Write an enzyme that holds these catalytic residues in place. Structure first.
Site, PDB file in Angstrom:
ATOM      1  N   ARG A 193     129.059  47.911  24.755  1.00 18.19           N
ATOM      2  CA  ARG A 193     130.216  48.732  24.643  1.00 18.19           C
ATOM      3  C   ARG A 193     130.144  49.718  23.447  1.00 18.19           C
ATOM      4  O   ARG A 193     130.526  49.532  22.527  1.00 18.19           O
ATOM      5  CB  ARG A 193     131.749  48.083  24.793  1.00 18.19           C
ATOM      6  CG  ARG A 193     132.143  47.522  26.154  1.00 18.19           C
ATOM      7  CD  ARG A 193     132.582  48.829  27.061  1.00 18.19           C
ATOM      8  NE  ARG A 193     133.313  48.030  28.181  1.00 18.19           N
ATOM      9  CZ  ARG A 193     133.679  49.123  29.003  1.00 18.19           C
ATOM     10  NH1 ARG A 193     133.680  50.360  29.088  1.00 18.19           N
ATOM     11  NH2 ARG A 193     134.271  48.437  30.167  1.00 18.19           N
ATOM     12  N   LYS A 239     126.845  41.285  42.918  1.00 27.55           N
ATOM     13  CA  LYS A 239     126.476  42.570  42.549  1.00 27.55           C
ATOM     14  C   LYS A 239     124.866  42.509  41.943  1.00 27.55           C
ATOM     15  O   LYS A 239     124.563  41.860  40.989  1.00 27.55           O
ATOM     16  CB  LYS A 239     127.493  43.034  41.685  1.00 27.55           C
ATOM     17  CG  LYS A 239     128.773  43.264  42.189  1.00 27.55           C
ATOM     18  CD  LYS A 239     129.683  43.614  41.215  1.00 27.55           C
ATOM     19  CE  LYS A 239     129.633  45.169  40.892  1.00 27.55           C
ATOM     20  NZ  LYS A 239     130.216  45.432  39.479  1.00 27.55           N
TER      21      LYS A 239
END
Ligand SMILES: O=P(O)(O)OC[C@H]1O[C@](O)(COP(=O)(O)O)[C@@H](O)[C@@H]1O
Ligand SMILES: O=P(O)(O)OC[C@H]1O[C@](O)(COP(=O)(O)O)[C@@H](O)[C@@H]1O
Ligand SMILES: O=P(O)(O)OC[C@H]1O[C@](O)(COP(=O)(O)O)[C@@H](O)[C@@H]1O
Ligand SMILES: [Mg+2]
Ligand SMILES: [Mg+2]
Lengths: 518, 518, 518
Positions: free
Chosen positions: B107, B257
């Site tokens: 992040r 995913k």
């Protein structure tokens, strides 16, 4: 573990898909033609040099805008950039020039006397359409002038009008003598001189306008390689372009742009009359529902592949690259699928004409094409092309399918073809070999026009005609060997296919040789 | 003339392409499942009612952002909108809820006040790359720091760090035969809190982070239908998600995913451990070269089709529709090709979460899917699926292949399947019939989870259990007849295929009937 | 409406069968080699002249019977008949000589002193088998002498003994030393010196007997083209024959006859070691159950086709033509199916050696072969041969396949191949073109040995070696043009495929030309 050869060996298309491998690298050769629209982002000699290096094969000139003087200068700059590499014949890349006609376009006028001013249109609002020339430079949120004097004859109450690449949509609620009362369906920002589409309507505008006539004549004067004829609806439209080009432009290739419902319905007659086709997805995707464009694209590519005629996939292929240095995932997919569909050429428009990243767009098309070319299921493709191609007595056609067959059998690094008019190389291309087709010609127009065909890597031989014909032939074969070695298509000891004829002249290709690279 | 039946009858794939016809209308039925990311553009009960009407089958909740309270409200709104249609059981559409995990991330950003101090760059600057937790939370000119610890051991000099998920590229170089160096390169800007990637690597980070643990537990409490597990690298990652969901979440579908090179390389083991796959093209296209994404997409769709496991194609499918009411031509192409590749589901992210045109995006996916479904070359597809599917003694598999064969032979309007767990309907879907599969179930979770499969149109039977089991079976068949008639899939006199079992309970489907619509 | 060209174009094998047309006449060219056994019916110079005219390509000498003197005279007569046509090199047909070994046969003695004397055996009756040479000449209704010393050690009680092409069967009732007692199960007319089969038993007789040595030696002296080696069980048997032939017979082709269980089981190793295979159906159909012979025939033809090695179908093809001037419908079928299976050669035994209608038998094989050759589904055959043949770097392979491809595309009247050893022509034959392969050679043995391959029509060039190699090459091409024209394979203006090499000597074929017939 190279060029999807594991996927190549699969017995089913499904297994072929299962075997596609991100760790299997492509060959150096790129087969798909790259057409770039030249404009302010790409017009300088210096930028054009980099375009060519990045893989540009055709320079598209869009005659919707600009003067003959502007276009003559662009053509001059293209030729300057191209010829700067003539010093090394091994590395020189021929570059074609394409003239794209304006055709029967419809455009609005100026928002409040400005080229850049915009207004907003809200969902539900009344907008009046006028043909009164007073409002030519005075368009606004309440009054829009557009340049098609017969709009009211061809539109009705309940018709849809599309403004600016179909982003703004209008519904004719009230029709007047020389005006239309519309309701904004899909609103947005309306700017100046935007493209107008009348999907419902039989538009009455000429195939070849007086401007199109002058532009086509200018193309002959400027020795252009090909014409991209906008808005072709029928075979008689093609014949009009052909008549205009005349005897003097008889060797200029006519590519019919299919961008309306009519063009699709009359595809076969248009194809028969043309030298090839562009799938002009921009207008096409406004004229027919957007969700149907892939149907028309795959139908036209298929029919062109079947006819052995060049097909271009055009418009918005890497659209987001106008503003961004990387494409979206849909754009990456679109390029790859156009290749897999069978397209000879992929195109860039705004991406190279006006965008912030023209060279990145070109590079990206190069990268994707080559990845997608290795992912072709040649085993099915070559079987189907053979089954569907007529048996003929033509020795060249027989030599060509035999050469392609041979190229699959020995996994050749290239098919070398000596060609005067390009025909022998075109005939090879029709059968879609995996290996590049190095087309050796002394004809500079032939070299340029060869970019219309998948796989054809043209090389312009500028060595003088050697007295013993056999020596002159060997010279040109050796030239191709040198090109292929320099470009890394193959190395000494590899096998290549070589196509020649039995006597000089044209129309005599009948000889196929399997030769080691010296 | 309807649903590309002329193209359907072609003897070759090439002729099939040649016959694709923009004037051949699709059937009413749409087979491809539509997954919509819910966010501020699409969160209201009123918008969600229209999303459902427009064709939303699954509501995706992205757990990268937002609190549990925010997500609980979204889920509540989804359920409010869905149940507003429960009044008519014939017309009620089940709507699934999917939780998409944050997964292990990085992040980027220290300065983060609505609009951050731009990345932009700085082609060699002080940020700077650290083998420490020392000079992290510090800024004096222009720096933006992350949240991840140990980079080393699984690292090599001069790698890339794609800030804002591929919007920014990076040069980052450490070892580096001279000290412990850093580097910076090409930029853009930043929204708020970005990401970092490490290409071709085996990244050590936990499969299931502490945050993921809390969100997965929340998902069980909130009775979600499925988990889209982010950044799956290996089978043990899937097993970790499965353990976290526990006995209480044992029926929640895990969709892995595939987001990176490792996930692609270890695809087979991941597939075997998962309930299905998402082709997460966003991260994938940052992790691997963008030009290779179509290879990994077609590989994974193919392998999933082969395995009979749901595959989702995700990310940027109609990206320009965030700002524009029509898609680009690349986007229309991308949607159509995902369906032609064989994707069970297509997905919308920013187009529905935050965009200006969420309903138009949904509608467009519906229109394209249905056009592309008619363009499938079923003749080859069904031959290849049969040839490649193991012969087994399983009566249900044999019944389900019999049903699809029969559906092709009589051109049936549907395949009606009674199913408790969905398994019998899944087994039909694997063989890709043209006709919709009306899956009749009393299990509301089964009805919601069935949207993972191509062609499964689930119907939730509310009718009470009839006294005679045979009559209760016939009641559910008749319910599906009523739904099909109401949706315009078929009319009285048409033939449909009906699948039932010989006794109540899961695992006894062994009966196939060809029946007229009453 | 010729050469089954309508059937040729069918998309399925079933439709291909539906389109077979009795009103579609064959070409002129017959591709399947015809092997005739020479004997009393056929050994006169005058009859042999007519056999050649009727289509005989190979003269088989069966060394089960007759002296070296008798065989030397036959060979002399074959050569006299062949050379009577040498006067016109354009019309001369090369004729091969094949030596078929006796091998490890078991034969009975003479009935009552005579070689033509016949007992009628009774069903259910008792018959004593002895190895006591006292009875070797004195064979009658209750006493039968065999020449196999080790009989008793290999045949257990209950064993089946077959006499005279399996027509008479006996069961081992009483097992002794030097003798056996049996009951006649299948009675019938027992004659003298009839073949015995022990299908149960591991017969320990040598691969190459002392008689076989004398015979093979004689074959070397007589300059035979090929050996048909009886009862090949294993690769070391082939190696034995090869070592026996030695340096002096190193160019003689070894055709391994497959006629027992073990030889079918060890087929692959036998094939690899041999120059080709004979499906020796006579013994094979006694050694293995009769109902399995078609399985072994189709297996061996298929594997030979795959290997590109000659395969002969032999035994009882037109058996009833020994006594009748027309064949049975089973026999017409058998001939047509052997060709359709992919046999290079068909064979006549008693039909030409001893029958009343040898020329009619030859003629019939020629008529059926040519009809069946037109009925081949070349579309599937050529696709399958391509898909199954290894990709190699071999230039000659690539040229040969290129050639066959080209020949299909232009419907060529022939493939002309210059060959020294035959190999380049063999490589074309492997891919099964419809058009005849005119193999031009100066090597008379090459010309004779070429009859082993489907479609190879050898022509022996007698013209002296021209000083300029290019002129010598063109001279041989023109010779083939003259042959083709004279035989009515093609006319002036038709196209043909021509294969040559880049330098003299074997192993340089790399040039394929599509040439009009002058
Ligand atoms: O493709 P095209 O225009 O028919 O040209 C192919 C011709 O090129 C050649 O290979 C070489 O011809 P030149 O020597 O005239 O250049 C001919 O033998 C052959 O007929
Ligand atoms: O797809 P599943 O979960 O195996 O369920 C199919 C089952 O549904 C039925 O048709 C009906 O079962 P119920 O009456 O118990 O719902 C069974 O005969 C069959 O075994
Ligand atoms: O089939 P083979 O034995 O390789 O012979 C083919 C050879 O015949 C030729 O065409 C002619 O060779 P010669 O002139 O020596 O007979 C060569 O170029 C070629 O290599
Ligand atoms: Mg246009
Ligand atoms: Mg035998």
């Amino acid at each position: 573990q190279t060029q999807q050869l594991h996927a190549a060996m699969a017995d089913t298309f499904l297994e072929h898909m299962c075997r596609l491998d991100i760790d299997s690298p492509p060959i150096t050769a790129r087969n798909t033609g790259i057409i770039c629209t030249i404009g302010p982002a790409s017009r300088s000699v210096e930028t054009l040099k980099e375009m060519i290096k990045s893989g540009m094969n055709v320079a598209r000139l869009n005659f919707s805008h600009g003067t003959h003087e502007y276009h003559a200068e662009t053509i001059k700059n293209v030729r300057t950039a191209t010829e700067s590499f003539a010093s090394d014949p091994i590395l020189y890349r021929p570059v074609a020039v394409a003239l794209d006609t304006k055709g029967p376009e419809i455009r609005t006028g100026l928002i409040k006397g400005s080229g850049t001013a915009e207004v907003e249109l809200k969902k539900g609002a009344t907008l009046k359409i006028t043909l009164d020339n007073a409002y030519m430079e005075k368009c606004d949120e309440n009054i829009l002038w557009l340049d098609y004097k017969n709009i009211c004859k061809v539109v009705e109450v309940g018709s849809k009008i599309y403004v600016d690449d179909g982003l703004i949509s209008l519904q004719v609620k009230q029709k007047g003598a020389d005006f239309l009362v519309t309701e904004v369906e899909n609103g947005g920002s309306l700017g100046s001189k935007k493209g107008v589409n009348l999907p419902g309507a039989a538009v009455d505008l000429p195939a070849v306008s007086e401007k199109d006539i002058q532009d086509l004549k200018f193309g002959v004067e400027q020795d252009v390689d090909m014409v991209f004829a906008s808005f072709i609806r029928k075979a008689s439209d093609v014949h009009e372009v052909r008549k205009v080009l005349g005897e003097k432009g008889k060797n200029i290739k006519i590519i019919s742009k299919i961008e309306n419902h009519e063009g699709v319905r009359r595809f076969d007659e248009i194809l028969e009359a043309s030298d090839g086709i562009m799938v002009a997805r921009g207008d096409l995707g406004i004229e027919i529902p957007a969700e149907k464009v892939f149907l028309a694209q795959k139908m036209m590519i298929g029919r062109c592949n079947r006819a052995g005629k060049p097909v271009i996939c055009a418009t918005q292929m890497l659209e987001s690259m106008i503003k961004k240095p990387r494409p979206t995932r849909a754009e990456g997919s679109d390029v790859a699928n156009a290749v897999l569909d069978g397209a000879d050429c992929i195109m860039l428009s705004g991406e190279t004409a006006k965008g912030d990243y023209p060279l990145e767009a070109v590079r990206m098309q190069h990268l994707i094409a080559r990845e997608a070319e290795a992912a072709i299921y040649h085993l099915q493709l070559f079987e189907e092309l053979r089954r569907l191609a007529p048996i003929t007595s033509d020795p060249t056609e027989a030599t060509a399918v035999g050469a392609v067959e041979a190229s699959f059998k020995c996994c050749s690094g290239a098919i070398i073809v000596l060609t005067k008019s390009g025909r022998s190389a075109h005939q090879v291309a029709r059968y879609r070999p995996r290996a590049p087709i190095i087309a050796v010609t002394r004809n500079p127009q032939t070299a340029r026009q060869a970019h219309l065909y998948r796989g054809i890597f043209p090389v312009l031989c500028k060595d003088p005609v050697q007295e013993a014909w056999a020596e002159d032939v060997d010279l040109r074969v050796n030239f191709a060997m040198n090109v292929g070695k320099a470009r890394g298509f193959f190395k000494k000891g590899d096998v290549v296919i070589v196509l020649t004829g039995w006597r000089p002249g044209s129309g005599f290709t009948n000889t196929m040789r399997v030769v080691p690279v010296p």
